[PDB]
Coordinates of C-alpha atoms and ligand atoms in Angstrom, one line a residue:
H7 CA 90.5 -22.9 -93.7
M8 CA 87.2 -23.9 -95.1
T9 CA 85.5 -27.1 -96.3
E10 CA 83.9 -26.9 -99.7
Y11 CA 80.5 -28.5 -100.2
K12 CA 79.2 -28.7 -103.8
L13 CA 75.4 -28.4 -104.1
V14 CA 73.1 -28.4 -107.1
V15 CA 69.6 -27.0 -107.1
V16 CA 67.3 -28.7 -109.6
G17 CA 63.6 -28.9 -110.4
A18 CA 61.1 -27.5 -112.8
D19 CA 61.5 -23.9 -113.9
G20 CA 59.2 -21.6 -111.9
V21 CA 59.4 -23.4 -108.5
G22 CA 61.8 -21.0 -106.8
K23 CA 65.3 -22.5 -107.4
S24 CA 66.7 -19.0 -107.9
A25 CA 64.7 -17.3 -105.2
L26 CA 65.8 -19.9 -102.7
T27 CA 69.4 -19.5 -103.6
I28 CA 69.2 -15.8 -103.5
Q29 CA 67.5 -15.8 -100.1
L30 CA 70.3 -18.0 -98.8
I31 CA 73.0 -15.8 -100.3
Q32 CA 71.6 -12.3 -100.0
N33 CA 68.7 -12.5 -97.4
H34 CA 66.2 -11.0 -99.9
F35 CA 63.2 -12.3 -101.9
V36 CA 63.4 -11.6 -105.6
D37 CA 60.1 -11.8 -107.4
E38 CA 61.2 -11.7 -111.1
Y39 CA 64.6 -13.3 -111.4
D40 CA 65.4 -14.1 -115.1
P41 CA 64.3 -17.7 -115.6
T42 CA 67.2 -18.4 -117.9
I43 CA 70.2 -17.2 -115.7
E44 CA 72.2 -20.2 -114.5
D45 CA 75.3 -19.6 -112.4
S46 CA 77.2 -20.8 -109.4
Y47 CA 77.4 -19.0 -106.1
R48 CA 79.5 -19.2 -103.0
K49 CA 78.6 -18.7 -99.4
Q50 CA 80.8 -18.9 -96.3
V51 CA 78.8 -20.2 -93.4
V52 CA 79.5 -22.1 -90.1
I53 CA 77.4 -25.2 -89.9
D54 CA 77.7 -27.3 -86.7
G55 CA 81.1 -25.7 -85.9
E56 CA 82.6 -26.3 -89.3
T57 CA 83.5 -23.3 -91.6
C58 CA 82.0 -24.3 -94.9
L59 CA 82.3 -22.7 -98.4
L60 CA 79.1 -23.8 -100.2
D61 CA 79.5 -24.0 -104.0
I62 CA 75.9 -23.9 -105.3
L63 CA 74.8 -24.2 -108.9
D64 CA 71.3 -22.8 -109.5
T65 CA 70.2 -24.7 -112.7
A66 CA 67.9 -23.1 -115.3
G67 CA 66.1 -24.7 -118.2
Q68 CA 66.8 -27.9 -120.2
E69 CA 68.7 -26.5 -123.1
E70 CA 72.0 -28.1 -124.0
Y71 CA 73.9 -28.2 -120.8
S72 CA 77.0 -26.0 -120.4
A73 CA 80.3 -27.7 -119.5
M74 CA 79.7 -26.2 -116.0
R75 CA 76.3 -27.7 -115.5
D76 CA 77.6 -31.1 -116.7
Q77 CA 80.5 -30.7 -114.3
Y78 CA 78.3 -29.9 -111.4
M79 CA 76.0 -32.9 -112.1
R80 CA 79.0 -35.2 -112.3
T81 CA 80.9 -33.8 -109.3
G82 CA 78.1 -32.3 -107.2
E83 CA 78.0 -33.8 -103.7
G84 CA 74.3 -33.1 -102.9
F85 CA 71.1 -32.0 -104.6
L86 CA 68.2 -29.9 -103.6
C87 CA 65.2 -31.3 -105.6
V88 CA 62.7 -28.5 -105.6
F89 CA 59.0 -28.4 -106.3
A90 CA 56.4 -25.8 -105.4
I91 CA 53.5 -26.7 -103.1
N92 CA 51.1 -24.9 -105.5
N93 CA 52.4 -26.6 -108.6
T94 CA 51.3 -30.2 -108.9
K95 CA 53.1 -30.7 -112.2
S96 CA 56.4 -29.6 -110.6
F97 CA 55.9 -32.3 -107.8
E98 CA 55.0 -35.0 -110.4
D99 CA 58.2 -34.1 -112.3
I100 CA 60.4 -34.7 -109.2
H101 CA 60.6 -38.4 -110.4
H102 CA 62.5 -37.2 -113.5
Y103 CA 65.0 -35.1 -111.5
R104 CA 65.6 -38.0 -109.2
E105 CA 66.1 -40.4 -112.1
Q106 CA 68.6 -38.0 -113.7
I107 CA 70.6 -37.8 -110.5
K108 CA 70.6 -41.6 -110.1
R109 CA 71.8 -42.0 -113.7
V110 CA 74.6 -39.3 -113.3
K111 CA 75.8 -41.0 -110.1
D112 CA 75.0 -44.6 -111.0
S113 CA 73.5 -44.9 -107.5
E114 CA 70.4 -44.9 -105.5
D115 CA 72.3 -43.4 -102.5
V116 CA 72.9 -39.8 -103.4
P117 CA 72.7 -36.9 -100.8
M118 CA 69.4 -35.2 -101.6
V119 CA 66.7 -33.2 -100.0
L120 CA 63.1 -32.9 -101.3
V121 CA 62.1 -29.2 -101.0
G122 CA 58.5 -28.0 -101.2
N123 CA 58.8 -24.3 -101.9
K124 CA 56.3 -21.4 -101.8
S125 CA 54.9 -22.4 -98.4
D126 CA 53.7 -18.9 -97.8
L127 CA 51.1 -19.1 -100.7
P128 CA 47.5 -20.1 -99.9
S129 CA 46.9 -22.3 -103.1
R130 CA 48.4 -25.5 -101.8
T131 CA 47.8 -28.4 -104.2
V132 CA 50.5 -30.7 -103.0
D133 CA 49.7 -32.0 -99.4
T134 CA 52.5 -32.4 -97.0
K135 CA 51.6 -36.1 -96.8
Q136 CA 52.1 -36.5 -100.5
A137 CA 55.6 -35.1 -100.2
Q138 CA 56.3 -37.2 -97.1
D139 CA 55.3 -40.3 -99.0
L140 CA 57.6 -39.4 -101.9
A141 CA 60.6 -38.6 -99.7
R142 CA 60.1 -41.8 -97.6
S143 CA 60.1 -43.8 -100.8
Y144 CA 63.5 -42.2 -101.8
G145 CA 64.9 -42.3 -98.3
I146 CA 65.6 -38.6 -98.2
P147 CA 64.4 -35.7 -96.0
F148 CA 61.5 -33.4 -97.0
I149 CA 61.5 -29.8 -96.0
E150 CA 59.0 -27.0 -96.9
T151 CA 60.4 -23.6 -97.6
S152 CA 59.4 -20.1 -98.5
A153 CA 61.9 -18.0 -100.4
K154 CA 59.6 -15.1 -99.6
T155 CA 59.6 -15.3 -95.8
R156 CA 62.8 -17.3 -95.5
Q157 CA 61.0 -20.1 -93.6
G158 CA 62.9 -23.3 -93.9
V159 CA 65.6 -21.9 -96.3
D160 CA 68.6 -22.3 -94.1
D161 CA 67.1 -25.6 -92.9
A162 CA 67.0 -27.0 -96.4
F163 CA 70.6 -26.1 -97.3
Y164 CA 72.1 -27.1 -93.9
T165 CA 70.2 -30.4 -94.0
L166 CA 71.7 -31.1 -97.4
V167 CA 75.2 -30.4 -96.0
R168 CA 74.4 -32.8 -93.2
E169 CA 73.2 -35.4 -95.7
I170 CA 76.5 -35.1 -97.5
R171 CA 78.4 -35.7 -94.3
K172 CA 76.2 -38.8 -93.6
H173 CA 77.3 -40.1 -97.0
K174 CA 81.0 -39.3 -97.0
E175 CA 83.8 -37.9 -94.8
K176 CA 84.3 -34.2 -95.5
Ligands
GDP201 N1 55.2 -16.4 -103.0 C1 56.3 -17.0 -103.4 N2 56.8 -16.8 -104.6 C2 57.9 -17.4 -104.9 C3 58.7 -18.2 -104.0 N3 59.8 -18.6 -104.6 C4 59.8 -18.1 -105.9 N4 58.7 -17.4 -106.0 C5 58.3 -16.7 -107.2 O1 58.1 -17.7 -108.2 C6 58.6 -17.3 -109.5 C7 59.7 -18.1 -110.0 O2 60.8 -18.0 -109.1 P1 62.3 -18.4 -109.6 O3 63.2 -18.3 -108.4 O4 62.6 -17.5 -110.8 O5 62.1 -19.9 -110.1 P2 63.1 -20.9 -110.8 O6 62.7 -20.9 -112.3 O7 62.8 -22.2 -110.1 O8 64.5 -20.3 -110.6 C8 59.0 -15.8 -109.3 O9 57.9 -15.0 -109.6 C9 59.3 -15.8 -107.8 O10 59.1 -14.5 -107.2 C10 58.1 -18.4 -102.6 O11 58.7 -19.1 -101.8 N5 57.0 -17.7 -102.4
MG202 MG1 66.0 -19.7 -111.9

């Protein structure tokens, strides 16, 4: 039997939340995924010898949350907080995503990974050292990813699983 891990992917629209999830699930890069589609996905994967069933919500927009999105924020075990390395505003807005998670959990100790996506693109406006400074302040890992090439994608999700295990018995 399989251990469930409930993961939530958050961040500004346009950063690659959906592309990252689709790369993890389907091993393909999608270049035009509807920016409004929000849904949950499953993936069976062995991580460090444990058969895991990941339960992943790919969040979209900031319209009135569905009961499902509210449920995933409340009961989610770990969060991928995504910005794009060519989107300075998305990096600046990570603060707000962190603050939301801390409020929902009433805690500063929540399993989380800072993800800098679109690492394949040449227009880098967020330096790795800026992201490292932010992640160090929050006490969380920082991983750069490309949903296009798959670089870092498994790393980001597996690291989030490992961060959940560091926080609680699973
Ligand atoms: N080059 C490149 N484009 C990406 C990457 N991730 C997402 N995109 C593109 O960025 C746009 C937004 O991606 P999407 O996954 O819909 O973003 P979301 O709003 O965060 O779900 C789309 O045109 C994607 O093809 C990436 O790693 N590299
Ligand atoms: Mg999306």
